[PDB]
Amino acid sequence: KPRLLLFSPSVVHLGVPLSVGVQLQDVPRGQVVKGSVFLRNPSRNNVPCSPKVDFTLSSERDFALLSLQVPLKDAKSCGLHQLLRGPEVQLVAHSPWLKDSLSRTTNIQGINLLFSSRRGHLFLQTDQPIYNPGQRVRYRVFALDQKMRPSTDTITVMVENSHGLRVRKKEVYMPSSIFQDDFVIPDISEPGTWKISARFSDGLESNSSTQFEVKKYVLPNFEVKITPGKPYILTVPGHLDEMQLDIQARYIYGKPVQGVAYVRFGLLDEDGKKTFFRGLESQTKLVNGQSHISLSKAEFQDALEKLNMGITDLQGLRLYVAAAIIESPGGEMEEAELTSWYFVSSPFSLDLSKTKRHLVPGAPFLLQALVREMSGSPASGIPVKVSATVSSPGSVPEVQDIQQNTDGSGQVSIPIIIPQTISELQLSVSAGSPHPAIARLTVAAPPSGGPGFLSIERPDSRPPRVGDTLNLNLRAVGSGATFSHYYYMILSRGQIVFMNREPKRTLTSVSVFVDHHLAPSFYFVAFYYHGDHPVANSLRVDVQAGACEGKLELSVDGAKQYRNGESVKLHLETDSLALVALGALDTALYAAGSKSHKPLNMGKVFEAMNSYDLGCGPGGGDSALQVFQAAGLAFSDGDQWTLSRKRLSC
Amino acid sequence: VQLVESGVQAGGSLRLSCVASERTYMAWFRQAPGKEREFVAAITSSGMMTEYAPSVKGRFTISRDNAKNTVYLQMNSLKPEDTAVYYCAADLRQRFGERVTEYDYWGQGTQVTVSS
Amino acid sequence: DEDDIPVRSFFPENWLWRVETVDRFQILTLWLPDSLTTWEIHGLSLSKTKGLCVATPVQLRVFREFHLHLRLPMSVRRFEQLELRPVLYNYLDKNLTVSVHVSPVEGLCLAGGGGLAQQVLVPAGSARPVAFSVVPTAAAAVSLKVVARGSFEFPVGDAVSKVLQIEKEGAIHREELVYELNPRGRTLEIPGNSDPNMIPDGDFNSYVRVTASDPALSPGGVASLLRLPRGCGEQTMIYLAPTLAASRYLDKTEQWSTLPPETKDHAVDLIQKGYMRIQQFRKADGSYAAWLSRDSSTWLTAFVLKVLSLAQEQVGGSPEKLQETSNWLLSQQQADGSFQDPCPVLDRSMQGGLVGNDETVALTAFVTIALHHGLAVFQDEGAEPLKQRVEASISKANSFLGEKASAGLLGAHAAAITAYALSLTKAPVDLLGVAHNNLMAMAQENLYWQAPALWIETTAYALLHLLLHKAEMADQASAWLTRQGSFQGGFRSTQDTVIALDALSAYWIASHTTEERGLNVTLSSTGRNGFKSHALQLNNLEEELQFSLGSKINVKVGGNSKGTLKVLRTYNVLDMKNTTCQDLQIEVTVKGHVEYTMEA
Amino acid sequence: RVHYTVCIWRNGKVGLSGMAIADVTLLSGFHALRADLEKLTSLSDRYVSHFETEGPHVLLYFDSVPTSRECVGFEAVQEVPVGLVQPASATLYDYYNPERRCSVFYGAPSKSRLLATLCSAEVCQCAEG
Ligand SMILES: *[C@@H]1O[C@H](CO)[C@@H](O[C@@H]2O[C@H](CO)[C@@H](O)[C@H](O)[C@H]2NC(C)=O)[C@H](O)[C@H]1NC(C)=O
Ligand SMILES: *[C@@H]1O[C@H](CO)[C@@H](O)[C@H](O)[C@H]1NC(C)=O
Ligand SMILES: *[C@@H]1O[C@H](CO)[C@@H](O)[C@H](O)[C@H]1NC(C)=O
Ligand SMILES: *[C@@H]1O[C@H](CO)[C@@H](O)[C@H](O)[C@H]1NC(C)=O
């Protein structure tokens, strides 16, 4: 019962190369199968939407990765833009071998793909984060293809308004990939959050939006921030945490400032309404730019009883704080706020988004959790206890307790062994000492009676640096020794960048050389056939942010503290020939009343890259079809086929 | 906060002194029978600056003692028809020169008469 | 010395905005702008080989030991007293007695009448603001330079020159003219500004604001209709009518993706083989009879023409082999335009709702509907004499149907079919109107007309007529067809299945249809500078355009879409706001002696 | 060598009732005596709840704003002669919303709270000299 397996990402972006994974299984080892794969849309008489691509592979090499080009001009030719319900294109594999040899219904095998014009990476950089009306707004947008190399296509720069109204549209073709432009704000425009949007002209929904805020302001000279001693308040009955915070006023150029610092406290509910306190208005004098403000527990009790709100009611209420630091003798005052401060019952937050659901019986199920102090960086040395409740239908549900101490980055991995034929697993994770943060979940076991599952495992259980070679182990569970080889494929950014075959042994150590093409998180799908059915278990694997590959290193001539009007020799380095987008931004603008939005930093670049990742969820699925859906893949072996995506984002 | 006051042929002189436990700017007021009291002079807490009633320009001077914290009011060259009861009073808000009667906790004063 | 002090005037908020190449080494000299702050310099490398990586920001810091921070207020009305406070800053280790004095600048009122030095002693590590109050009386903007010249004990001086911009007379007023737009009421006029509060000379900036303000059967059951054609020359069509209808119905509805893609290529071969299966039953004159030996039947020839002509868009058939087939049908037209069956079909079941009291009316309607379907497949070149007689044949046929259609007293199936046939072939309007009016009255009340074979078919044909004549009637019609078609094993017969699938295919494409929704307007007026025009395209978002039209403007909105258009006008008026504080007030009186170096 | 009497009042019943922060600014070389202000705060009957004084600037936080013209004073000294004649300033920031301030002026004892302008018209000229 030979089969032709067809693999490809469950979304295809028009205008950029597509990668299709095709292979053979259960071959008599004496025949060579040749065929073609092409994109045909059914609604228009099956006209191709892409050039024909053939694989012509044999049994000795049954795995093949095909780089399918899908030019956008053909998409217009086949009328893909003329569809009336959803962008549904079909990818098919045509080969006479299917009809003559396998005696199938037709000599063609295919899948259903949801195409979308989204393509290329567009990064927008504005002159300064905030504008007062009447100023000349500069900006530039970077055009980058999927492979993060400079592109030379045409884009439609669009400058929206606060109310949501277009103000300026420009179409331009950029042979240098950097488009510089200057736009002028009206002198009457009311304060608000504007927006710049740029999208590839030929494409439709490849827009990337940056928001520059227009507000009425003048440049301040000292920026004050409020840093509470502990960013959370414990409010469980009996014990109430002391509420103290430190007010720091420093000039934009660093030196401390001396003056007064008025403070008013309050409570913010979820919607945003404020409710201040009377008599708690504590004002001080800054000493060396620092002042400490505290509220005795008794004093706090007086304020609430006066308000009659009570203590037990502070469930999701936030401790408002504002300051009005007046720089005596200058007199200029620059207020601050501390909206982010909650009344929480525990000092830690449980992040269990990484533990994969759908436990695989018979293999060590791993529980990945990230414990982070609320509104703070990940914390180390937090013992975490788990109470797994294995639900065996034929016996009393067993309970297993195990504990482990945070590695140092906030992650914990505790393998809990689960037996066969288990109804489900319900566990509670407690992290903290004292006042543990409890967050219990249950995972349903895959239906029994199916073909033997597969169990991937990562020994190091630590994200790999770029350039490492992580190791992964596989093993079938159950009496499924029919197969002879282990199959796997590496997915990153919705493109099968590596497909390979592995032989079966006592231990199967599959090595992945994590290269830049696998970042920030590359899936890892592996499968084998229990004779006829497929069984698989993918694995979301993260990759550390690492560093540049272009190596843009900005530096200066030491630290001389140049006086105004002086000349500085900036030193910059680049690994390759590149165009550097130098931009100098006064820091006081961050002080000017604004959200303090993050600039264009690696957090967004890698977020932008991975925004193309189609699969979601950490991995693993009950049935081979479900796992291949979750990884962002289309799978069709002739007998079982992958359902098309219901929508672009899960 | 209580005020205590203690202390003559025409052309003479007098040195009235009012003692207050708290150290402040207490001024001098005079009241004659049948008519409303009118100020004579005042002195601030530090005593750097003082004002006198226009009728006694250059004639009545005020000084204070930093140890016993009083007011020393010498009255050289008395003018014969100035007879009246003099009141030393103050407020807690240092409203120097506040001519009109907005002083609280008035003192009792002392009777003084001038004979031609 | 006044001149020696290096006046500082360059106070940008972003200066190193450029782009340049890299070759592992370049020494670019940056001249720090004359501002005291720490600069968040950064950059992005854009390389052809490697690509982008965001650099690590560099926190350059520029600062002077003894500086002067002068922070002008943004809005400084004229005729209003102003408070300027240059806060001397002295981080040195020496007590300095410096002098602050705004240099005499035309267009302003110096409190001292000009350059009067105000000696001030600044304890080290402290600030000594020297309040300056100058009332602005200039026209547009005045640049005032504050010079801090120190004593000879340690002569360090600073000089800041910040440009002060003075706002125009009075406050600012906003006029919001909310209106509407539509395809009647096309042209509207906006009255020109006539408020008496207008300042005769002043900035009159106006902006426009236009807003667009914009507002399937089971793929499983229908996919089961794809069956391999089999049987005699009659049965080969029963399995080939739904087979093409299902393939066509899912082609137009875009439901192939729901089915496995091999199914589409599995069906394209059922029709391909099906076309051959029925083609070999063709007679010499293209009769497509039930059997080669049996006499021909015009009904089947019409039915086979419709199905085959429709499938001709896919199978690479021979156009001339189809042209002759139409010729046979024409030759059977009678004197009045009717069609008579030369041999009835062996099985009357496939006829659907044709069997009944009257047949010639339905035959005429059914054949003409099919007969037109063959017009599309005719070659654009040649057969011109053949084509011409076709229009005459249908026109003669339409006349008979119209005569019967207006007569009335006809069956429901005849009534519905007659409506569509006249609609398809563009029958004369009067006949079209009377025929259409005949259908609605005969209709019955998503209750319209389980459903037997007769009712299901007539609805589909009528439903098609409503689409070609969709407003609360077709939409309420499909709710009976789809509900009637969703039953298990629905669409019992062959004629209903082929045509019902056609109506839903036609109905679906109508209901799920989108247009340009254009709304572009035109603004024009006779301004002082002359005549100006503008337009605002809103095919697919909202737009606002800066237009220079100081008089009454002309609007010529056009487009089926409807939206909201409002125009914003900005100008200055005569102010009336009290200068005295209304809620909270201060009263401070300084009494005593203040010594002066010089007094007027 | 110079006296002050800062006076503040509030109409009330507006809904913005709250504490106030005086922003009194002195002439050149003036700084209030810390002894005088300290006396204001220590008293049981305290009006200037919190005060900070550095050089010209003086902050007199007021816990209660009376409806009437009930107000406090204090003394000040001078060291450097004032080199020019002009009106200094003042400002009452609402402690809960400093954007509803109240800028006011004053001057030397014999002078006024404004400068001499012949403005009174479309044409507008001043006569300081
Ligand atoms: C491109 O533009 C579209 C429409 O203007 C944006 O669609 C929004 O997407 C966000 C999240 O992706 C949703 O929360 C909004 O509701 C969407 N708006 C509408 C009107 O559908 C889209 O986000 C833009 N692209 C990017 C990258 O931001
Ligand atoms: C500045 O004057 C103060 C006056 O108290 C004095 O204490 C200080 O030493 C002086 N600074 C220098 C550098 O002499
Ligand atoms: C938009 O303007 C064009 C002129 O270029 C005109 O032909 C078109 O009709 C306008 N739009 C609509 C909806 O009428
Ligand atoms: C407010 O302005 C009006 C006239 O503009 C004036 O009569 C009134 O006195 C002002 N308010 C106060 C508190 O004086």
Numbering used by the authors:
A (entry chain A): 20 to 669
B (entry chain D): 2 to 8, 12 to 120
C (entry chain B): 768 to 950, 954 to 985, 994 to 1223, 1227 to 1230, 1256 to 1275, 1278 to 1348, 1354 to 1413
D (entry chain C): 1465 to 1593
Sentences copied from the publication:
Cleavage of the mammalian plasma protein C4 into C4b initiates opsonization, lysis, and clearance of microbes and damaged host cells by the classical and lectin pathways of the complement system. C4 is cleaved into a small fragment, C4a, and a large fragment, C4b, that act as an opsonin. C4b is covalently linked to the targeted surface through a reaction of its reactive thioester moiety with available nucleophiles on the surface. Subsequently, C4b binds protease C2 and forms proconvertase C4b2 that is further processed into C4b2b, which is the (CP and LP) C3 convertase that cleaves C3 (15).
